[PDB]
């Protein structure tokens, strides 16, 4: 199908307890493959999936060098922002950044992203044309002006339309078994009675990959959202995911309710009934 590769950077300041901390992680789809941690002893980019381990020493050295320069900048960027926003040094603050690219089933560029957040709120983002930026407030306008003069957009464009796309394709090939599978959800339904008048139906999906999935309830074939609960999709720890949806129904009416499971590993959506 389609595929994506993202890097997620998190920088945090620790006033009164030390210098900032920078953590980077890299994903292909819902599978993590690298990490870097400025607090850790190794000070190298580390493998986090079997299929990246085969990359050679210059791969690891160049990735380490690149992420170390970002680590150093973003750790300094915390002091910059605290000055733009006139924040007291008493406060602990956060810079986040996501960037990466999607490709279609032909392996070719669809879309690329670069988005930054300061304390969980949008700061600056690269627009879809990869040539201009959207600043969120007057502080991020300072950064926008700096980046537009120095022409930093087209370096992002080159990376996002070239190197990102091309190594995503390499990783997709090297980790064929892991990354290009669809593990169909294994489903079942539980039932929990607390009293005589009311029972909870729970629809389960286990062992599925990719993470994208939809569970919906129906009564008599009609959609039903009243009295339903849906938990966050959650990792099993073995590369698959889990999810459930539940509904409270009056006793005796269980038979009318259907759970519906849509996942790209299922040729036809599943239908389950108590």
């Amino acid at each position: 199908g389609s595929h994506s590769m993202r890097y997620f950077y998190t920088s945090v300041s620790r006033p009164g307890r030390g210098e900032p901390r920078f953590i980077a992680v890299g994903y292909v789809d819902d599978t993590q493959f690298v990490r870097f941690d400025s607090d850790a002893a190794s000070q190298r980019m580390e493998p986090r999936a079997p299929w990246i381990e085969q990359e050679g020493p210059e791969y690891w050295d160049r990735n380490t060098r690149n992420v170390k320069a970002h680590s150093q900048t973003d750790r300094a960027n915390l002091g910059t922002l605290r000055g733009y926003y006139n924040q007291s040094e008493d406060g602990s603050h956060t810079i986040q950044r996501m960037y990466g690219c999607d490709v279609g089933p032909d392996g070719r560029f669809l879309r690329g992203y670069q988005q930054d957040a300061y304390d969980g709120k949008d700061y600056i983002a690269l627009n879809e044309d990869l040539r201009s930026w959207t600043a969120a407030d007057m502080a991020a306008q300072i950064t926008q002006r700096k980046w537009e003069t120095a022409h930093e957009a087209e370096q992002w464009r080159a990376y996002l339309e070239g190197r990102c796309v091309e190594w995503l394709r390499r990783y997709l090939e090297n980790g064929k078994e892991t990354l290009q599978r669809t593990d169909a959800p294994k489903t079942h339904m539980t039932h929990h009675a607390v009293s005589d008048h009311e029972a909870t139906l729970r629809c389960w999906a286990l062992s599925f990959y990719p993470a994208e999935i939809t569970l919906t309830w129906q009564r008599d074939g009609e959609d039903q959202t009243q009295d339903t609960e849906l938990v966050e999709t959650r990792p099993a720890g073995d590369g698959t995911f889990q999810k459930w949806a539940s509904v409270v129904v009056p006793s005796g009416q269980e038979q009318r309710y259907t759970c519906h499971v849509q996942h790209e590993g299922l040729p036809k959506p599943l239908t389950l009934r108590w």
């Binding site: 990735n63 300094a76 930054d116 700096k146 990102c164």
Partner: peptide, 9 residues
């Protein structure tokens, strides 16, 4: 592959 881009604020 990590990008070699600039991100100073």
């Amino acid at each position: 592959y990590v990008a070699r881009t600039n991100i100073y604020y």
